[PDB]
Amino acid sequence: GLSDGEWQQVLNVWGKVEADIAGHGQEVLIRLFTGHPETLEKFDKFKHLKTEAEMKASEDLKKHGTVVLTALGGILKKKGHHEAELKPLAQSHATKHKIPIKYLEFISDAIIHVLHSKHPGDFGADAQGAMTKALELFRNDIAAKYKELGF
Ligand SMILES: O=N[O-]
Numbered sequence: 001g002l003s004d005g006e007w008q009q010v011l012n013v014w015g016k017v018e019a020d021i022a023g024h025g026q027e028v029l030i031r032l033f034t035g036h037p038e039t040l041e042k043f044d045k046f047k048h049l050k051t052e053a054e055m056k057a058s059e060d061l062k063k064h065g066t067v068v069l070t071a072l073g074g075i076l077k078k079k080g081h082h083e084a085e086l087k088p089l090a091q092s093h094a095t096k097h098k099i100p101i102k103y104l105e106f107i108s109d110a111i112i113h114v115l116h117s118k119h120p121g122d123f124g125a126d127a128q129g130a131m132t133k134a135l136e137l138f139r140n141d142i143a144a145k146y147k148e149l150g151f
Pocket residue numbers: 029064068
């Protein structure tokens with residue numbers, strides 16, 4: 001889906017995330033939950049987080065942030081050749097977690113937002129184009145498996 005140039009940008013940007021995977025993960029999930037509270041309802045382990053202060057204080061939210069972004073980082077490093085890596089996540093998110101694809105669009109928007117917020121002026125126009133394309137590629141492939149499943 002992406003040029004070599006663009007994957008190079010993606011993985012350069014991802015270097016920022018890897019310097020603090022838990023901090024980026026936490027902010028991504030906070031941005032997701034605060035912006036779209038219905039998403040929090042999908043996590044019976046975060047459902048108790050009534051306030052953003054409680055979210056910020058939750059070490060388990062940070063932990064999940066690390067899981068989510070580690071899984072994404074793994075995927076991104078495959079530069080689109082990610083069928084094996086994406087399959088179980090499509091299946092778990094459609095069949096077990098019941099996550100509509102729209103919420104994957106929300107978390108993609110949250111990643112772009114967090115990158116800007118944590119790295120203002122350091123996440124260039126090209127970098128945003130490339131990262132956006134990578135996230136859409138990820139979403140588009142998840143969506144194909146959701147359609148296979150009828151979800
Ligand atoms: O936070 N997505 O598992």
